[PDB]
Design a protein around this ligand. Structure first.
Ligand code: HEM
Ligand code: HEM
Ligand SMILES: *[C@@H]1O[C@H](CO)[C@@H](O[C@@H]2O[C@H](CO)[C@@H](O)[C@H](O)[C@H]2NC(C)=O)[C@H](O)[C@H]1NC(C)=O
Ligand SMILES: *[C@@H]1O[C@H](CO)[C@@H](O[C@@H]2O[C@H](CO)[C@@H](O)[C@H](O)[C@H]2NC(C)=O)[C@H](O)[C@H]1NC(C)=O
Ligand SMILES: *[C@@H]1O[C@H](CO)[C@@H](O)[C@H](O)[C@H]1NC(C)=O
Ligand SMILES: *[C@@H]1O[C@H](CO)[C@@H](O)[C@H](O)[C@H]1NC(C)=O
Ligand SMILES: *[C@@H]1O[C@H](CO)[C@@H](O)[C@H](O)[C@H]1NC(C)=O
Ligand SMILES: *[C@@H]1O[C@H](CO)[C@@H](O)[C@H](O)[C@H]1NC(C)=O
Ligand SMILES: [Cl-]
Ligand SMILES: [Cl-]
Ligand SMILES: [Cl-]
Ligand SMILES: [Cl-]
Ligand SMILES: [Cl-]
Ligand SMILES: [Cl-]
Ligand SMILES: [Cl-]
Ligand SMILES: [Cl-]
Ligand SMILES: [Cl-]
Ligand SMILES: [Cl-]
Ligand SMILES: [Cl-]
Ligand SMILES: [Mg+2]
Ligand SMILES: [Mg+2]
Lengths: 231, 232
């Protein structure tokens, strides 16, 4: 019913492996266009068993990246400073290169994490957050690192652990996480199953909280958290 | 003819916005103030006032943050302090000091009495009102929030009352039209008000808000980061 197909050149994609994977399976429109908030809620439920609370807020902020009244394209979501942030797991900082497309060299840090284990977990996820921020601080003179970016980065790490793995423990098989990022594909052939446990603020926040404590974080002085309001 | 004024009944929801409240009171928006989508705001702003989508779409997307629903808000949701609703309102009390939702004559007194001895409000009077209303909040509200975000919104709101009740090009409005708009949330059609024949856009509003800004004698509160409260 929902086969994987690589996006063609008319097919718009985002910096989000979550939404890109849903589009690549037709849970969202395969062209990544004309997406409403209710379409996000239904796709997150259908693909991942993610519940509306977190999706509705993310989607309302996503709408700010679009000139349209009540839809965005996946490509709109690249707008730097709305949701898109520096120290991404698999994308370059906007200031240093391409903030939109999967990049293997950036992904290397997450790929190689939890060395010697068959899983990623909260400990490895925190170490990756720390290493990816340190890389941005070392190479990007324009890095934006406030409470807003940090909260989002901990919830994004909670999402990859939760959707590709176990939503209760935040432990995920490495091969599922690698396919999710590298191919934006549900690893069904490799044994991945949609969570039987609803994924909610109440499951994600405890995981994001533990990842937070394992990240050793401090905000940049002199930066006010902000949501860029227009493209 | 198709859009008569009716006072809201006791279960009709209203906002801190005379703009949206007036549209609801004429049925350009649902008279009950419920189930408002972004397209409904765009159509109502066009139909009532000849206001174009650019500014309405952004305001409505931020308004959605005040609602727990996927793609609608009520007019009453928009009272959420720190999303759009701000201190030093023209016609409402600060959230910290009282009622941030309902029209209040004692607050409105400053705008009512502005440009003394003239029959119009204009950019100069609008700036003096912004200065006096912020001075009042700084004096009486220990919790006043006064950043570039609240100031920009306050200048655009004053550009809106001048533009919709008056001349969208000059930002001059008849005092009578402005007083009816705030006090009754009614289009003063009986008293001679006509919908702009000139589209009201970011390009007409921003120059007026800019000149109101320069006439406001404004400075930000220094320790405060601009923020949009993301949930109720
Ligand atoms: C449905 C479940 C979701 C999952 C599992 C998910 C997962 C993720 C993950 C793991 C990242 C990190 C990518 C990286 O750092 O390289 C990410 C980033 C992002 N997501 Fe999502 N996401 C979801 C929903 C959403 C929604 C609803 C929106 C917006 C409407 C959104 C917008 C973004 C954006 C703009 C980024 C880029 C942040 C950055 O710069 O890395 N996501 N998402
Ligand atoms: C359509 C034309 C509009 C006009 C002419 C207009 C006009 C105004 C005016 C003059 C005020 C100031 C009230 C005061 O300070 O006492 C105001 C406040 C407000 N407006 Fe609007 N508005 C419009 C559209 C909107 C839209 C689309 C939204 C939200 C979706 C909105 C939300 C608000 C809010 C929340 C306030 C309260 C701010 C405060 O004083 O604390 N307005 N509006
Ligand atoms: C994440 O996985 C790693 C690797 O399995 C865990 O760290 C190891 O924990 C074992 C089991 O107690 C220790 O004996 C090893 O010495 C640890 N190795 C390293 C390099 O850390 C880690 O505990 C896991 N984290 C969570 C929250 O489950
Ligand atoms: C707004 O209206 C006021 C009052 O009419 C204007 O200020 C007056 O301007 C006249 C003629 O230019 C001066 O001679 C008066 O002394 C001013 N009166 C007061 C009360 O100050 C003001 O210029 C108008 N502003 C704009 C931008 O049109
Ligand atoms: C997820 O982890 C919990 C807690 O260890 C476990 O009981 C549950 O069976 C796991 N879920 C699946 C489907 O494996
Ligand atoms: C209007 O809004 C509420 C949510 O606040 C919804 O549950 C209700 O069904 C809607 N009613 C109509 C008539 O659309
Ligand atoms: C100011 O805000 C704080 C935090 O919300 C609140 O507890 C306090 O009562 C407020 N103080 C005044 C005088 O409004
Ligand atoms: C608005 O002001 C302009 C510039 O003075 C004027 O030419 C125009 O006619 C005014 N509009 C109306 C309907 O009076
Ligand atoms: Cl961008
Ligand atoms: Cl930048
Ligand atoms: Cl590691
Ligand atoms: Cl970190
Ligand atoms: Cl299969
Ligand atoms: Cl902005
Ligand atoms: Cl109605
Ligand atoms: Cl409130
Ligand atoms: Cl307050
Ligand atoms: Cl005055
Ligand atoms: Cl908030
Ligand atoms: Mg990024
Ligand atoms: Mg107010």
């Amino acid at each position: 019913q929902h086969p994987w197909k690589a996006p063609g050149p008319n097919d718009l994609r985002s910096p989000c492996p979550g939404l890109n994977t849903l589009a690549n399976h037709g849970f969202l429109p395969r062209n990544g266009r004309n997406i409403t908030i209710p379409m996000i809620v239904q796709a997150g439920f259908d693909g991942y068993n993610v519940q509306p609370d977190i999706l509705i807020l993310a989607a309302k902020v996503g709408l700010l990246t679009s000139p349209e009244p009540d839809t965005f394209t996946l490509d709109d979501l690249k707008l730097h400073g709305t949701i898109e942030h520096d120290a991404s797991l698999s994308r370059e900082d906007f200031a240093l290169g391409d903030n939109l497309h999967f990049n293997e060299a950036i992904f290397n840090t997450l790929a190689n994490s939890n060395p010697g284990s068959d899983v990623y977990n909260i400990t490895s996820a925190g170490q990756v957050l720390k290493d990816r921020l340190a890389d941005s601080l070392a190479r990007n003179p324009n890095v934006t690192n406030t409470g807003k970016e940090f909260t989002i980065r901990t919830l994004e790490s909670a999402f990859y652990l939760s959707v590709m793995g176990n939503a209760t423990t935040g432990e995920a098989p490495k091969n599922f996480v690698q396919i999710f990022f590298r191919e934006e594909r549900l690893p069904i052939e490799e044994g991945w199953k949609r969570s039987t446990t609803p994924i909610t603020s109440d499951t994600l926040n405890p995981i994001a909280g533990q990842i937070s404590e394992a990240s050793n974080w401090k905000p940049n002085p002199d930066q006010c958290p902000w949501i860029v309001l227009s493209p």
